[PDB]
């Protein structure tokens, strides 16, 4: 199954509390971008040595309780660091201001870079801890078997696939740091069905 399982349409949330100084939310809600912002770049003189830069965490504005789930979007080559996967309310009260157990899971993206977090139970040949970043990033959320896979949709391939805690609400997490951008993919079906949309509603006579 291509796709592993139905595709799962949401939003960024813009309710969620996130970070409006460090994260910019395009028109549509469906890419948000990390920047320095103004406070930050308009006390730039005092900065000589670094800064404490925090990590800024939103959500997308659908919640999963139950099914199978699939979702896909891109990260920008340029992504300083970039965490993406899935979160419980409780976990997420945190960030916003066994693996079976644990009700969250975050990949890290950076440098052009996908970063393996670990690999336990799998001891059948080496396997990287740095892979080139997917063009297309998938993950796919199973309430059922209480599993959470990522998937290269350039090549379709799994690159990792962790037990994750599904007794409470998940929701599509994301969390930007630098300067990065995630933009939420919509399947080439939907592309079609617009075209569809399009021509109907839209052809006029000169």
């Given at each position: 199954?291509?796709?592993?399982?139905?595709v799962f349409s949401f939003l960024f949330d813009e309710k969620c509390g996130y970070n409006n100084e460090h994260l910019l939310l395009n028109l549509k809600r469906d890419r948000v971008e990390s920047r320095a912002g103004f406070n930050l770049l308009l006390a730039a003189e005092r900065i000589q040595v670094g800064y404490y830069t925090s990590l800024d965490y939103?959500?997308?504005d659908t919640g999963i309780t139950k099914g199978k789930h699939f979702w896909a979007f891109r990260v920008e080559p340029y992504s300083y660091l970039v965490k993406?996967?899935?979160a419980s309310s409780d976990?997420?009260?945190?960030?916003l201001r066994f693996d079976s157990s644990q009700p969250?899971?975050?990949v890290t993206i950076g440098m052009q870079k996908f970063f393996i977090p670990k690999s336990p139970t799998s001891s059948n040949e080496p396997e990287n801890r740095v892979l080139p970043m997917p063009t297309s990033i998938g993950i796919f959320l199973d309430c059922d078997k209480g599993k959470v896979n990522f998937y290269d949709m350039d090549q379709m391939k799994c690159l990792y696939e962790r037990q994750v805690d599904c007794s409470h609400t998940l929701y599509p997490a994301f969390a930007l740091?630098?300067?990065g951008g995630i933009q939420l993919e919509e399947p080439i079906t939907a592309k079609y069905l617009e075209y569809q949309e399009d021509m109907a509603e839209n052809l006029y006579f000169q």
């Open positions: 199954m291509t796709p592993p399982a139905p939103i959500i997308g993406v996967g899935v976990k997420l009260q945190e960030w969250f899971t975050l740091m630098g300067s």
